[PDB]
Amino acid sequence: MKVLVTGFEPFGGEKINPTERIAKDLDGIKIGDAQVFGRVLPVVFGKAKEVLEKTLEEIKPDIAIHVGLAPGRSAISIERIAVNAIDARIPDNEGKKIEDEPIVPGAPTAYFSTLPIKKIMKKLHERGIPAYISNSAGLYLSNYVMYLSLHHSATKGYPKMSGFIHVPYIPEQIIDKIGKGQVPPSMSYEMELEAVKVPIEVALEELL
Amino acid sequence: MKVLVTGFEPFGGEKINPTERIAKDLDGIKIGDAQVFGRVLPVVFGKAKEVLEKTLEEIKPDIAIHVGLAPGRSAISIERIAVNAIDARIPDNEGKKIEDEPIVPGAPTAYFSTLPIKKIMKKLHERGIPAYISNSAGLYLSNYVMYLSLHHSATKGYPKMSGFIHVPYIPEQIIDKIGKGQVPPSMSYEMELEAVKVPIEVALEELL
Amino acid sequence: MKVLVTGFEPFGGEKINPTERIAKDLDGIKIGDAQVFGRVLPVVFGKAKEVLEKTLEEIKPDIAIHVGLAPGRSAISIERIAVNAIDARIPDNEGKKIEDEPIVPGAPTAYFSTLPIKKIMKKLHERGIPAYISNSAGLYLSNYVMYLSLHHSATKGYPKMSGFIHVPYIPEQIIDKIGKGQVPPSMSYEMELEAVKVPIEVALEELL
Amino acid sequence: MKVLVTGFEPFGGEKINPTERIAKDLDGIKIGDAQVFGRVLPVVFGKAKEVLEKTLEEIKPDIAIHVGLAPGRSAISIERIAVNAIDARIPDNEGKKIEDEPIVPGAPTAYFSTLPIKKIMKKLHERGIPAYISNSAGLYLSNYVMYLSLHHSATKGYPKMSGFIHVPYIPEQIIDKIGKGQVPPSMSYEMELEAVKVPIEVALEELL
Known part of the structure; x- marks a missing residue:
């Protein structure tokens, strides 16, 4: 079995994206006989699709877990649904800044994630x-990647399982916000990393 | 030097109080030259006061750092002000459920914390x-203890420094709250424990 | 031209549902030459569907605006997507309490609202x-009704336009909640009523 | 009887301050036999004190209600306590930008509002x-004015009743913030105006 994990580079004026470190830390690990591949994606429309599709064809994973930063969210969230829309x-x-365009003209309005989300939770x-089910992944780059990955699955027959995990800010990202207004929630890096490993294990369990 | 650290027991139907664990973990340890004593206070009006005065008179600490759970808070908070009121x-x-009463009749309306709060932050x-300055400790048991402590200092000439640190929920407290609606912020136990050791260190450094 | 507006009965232990009162205030009114029909729906899976579909066939509106209460939301939200799922x-x-079930087995995973959502905003x-675009209507009764309405449109050819507006609590609903901590946003009833009329006006203008 | 109501000018990038309109709308009215004076204060340390102390001396009111904007607050808030500190x-x-300075060196650390806060609520x-009791007025211009007014009361014997009321954004202030992402709570201007009149009414009734 092959597992792909993706993360994103820093965006929105942030110095870091904890998911870039998660992808890098998960690259090369094994869970049982399963090999994990971790790749970092650009937070860039068009370019993220090219990198994603190249990566999928190269690796042909059985399971793809895509990870993103969800600023302001207080727990791990497992995305249920990917939407064929961009409104950045x-x-x-x-x-x-793309507004009211489809991701793939003519493709289904949405795809459900095929990860065992409830078992993962x-x-x-x-x-x-702390983890919950999220019913919108936004309409920015997280959703864009989530949708393209499920569309690839529906269209190519691989990955068999595909979904998205959003993570809170890590505490060090909060320091800079303190002298500026409201203080967003955070979660320690080590918990976020473990919270990505868990979906892989549960997914591998459920597959075959 | 002597440092008192108090925590509180569980309250409001919670299974746990992280500050109880913190007081018990820091109990008996040494930070530089100072001995640290860790005591758990009851979340009970009257009784907490009796326990707190007995503990202060017994130990005669140079520094008192009082620690409480602040549900819904997303970073460490350092209390600036203790208020002469109870409104549970x-x-x-x-x-x-004591409503609209003084803590100490005739005593001042408020006392400023004597911890070096900005240096601690x-x-x-x-x-x-992540940490900020809070300007109200509530009017329940946290503020009661914070007021009685600072009053003891002004009245008895010790501790020379006294103040209050509120901590968020730890991740494990959040799990049962997911099925039931909104999802409070949390902070790892390890980070909260370190965030009380630090107030001791800088308080010890600012004294003599 | 014919417009159906729906609201919901009280639920979740609430004494009132402001959308029940909105639907009653709009029932029988005219917007120019357009006749408006207001109908209150039960917050009951199965029964809501029977009532909705019967009402749709009875009236055959050109435009259907479904309105629901969204506790904790601070502004008017216009729903972009309906999802083929119930997870109450x-x-x-x-x-x-139905969990992880289709609303209509074999029908599209989602439908986009056919209201002119951006012009309404x-x-x-x-x-x-204050109004924004919401990308999830939840997976309870609002989404259920939103989906069934858009399904009827795609499948029967009427309504021509269909969508969903969520409203905050109205200020009176906040009174009993002030004791128990969290103080939710609200919006005056008059503004909420006006915010439902506006979609009717814009939809009518965009039709023909 | 004579009643002073103050509000503030716009601050912090905001086009309007609703408390400015409130003060101007209340000026010159009568509540029963009592005469209401409405004054707009500058959001400026030093100048606001000069203006406040001059107006208090000129009018010598029996009751002083100071009103200000609290961005992010979802209901009316009646301030319990003013604190002898500025931390802008x-x-x-x-x-x-004043940091960690007292308002009146020598004066008490805090004064309680002498408005019948619980009856007002x-x-x-x-x-x-919707209304609740706030235990911190911040440490900017609202608290500054709240403190100086109560200090004036204790020091000169007038006003007999002094206190502070904070109001949420009004809905028109929210519009430009929807692009910016997050969407703060608001309250209708009409409800906010009514909500400072009630304090005048219950305070007049309290004073003989």
């Missing part, structure tokens, strides 16, 4: 990790 | 711990 | 009414 | 207006 609340990293809770 | 939003652990930031 | 966070008004703004 | 999170309207509730 902020520009991508190249200043491209249950297992995180057992591990002491 | 919920009953204490014996079912007493600066040190917490450079250690990667 | 609380039971419905007959105690039914723009119009509300210039009317001084 | 943002500069004032003249670019001055009870009456606001019966009127369908």
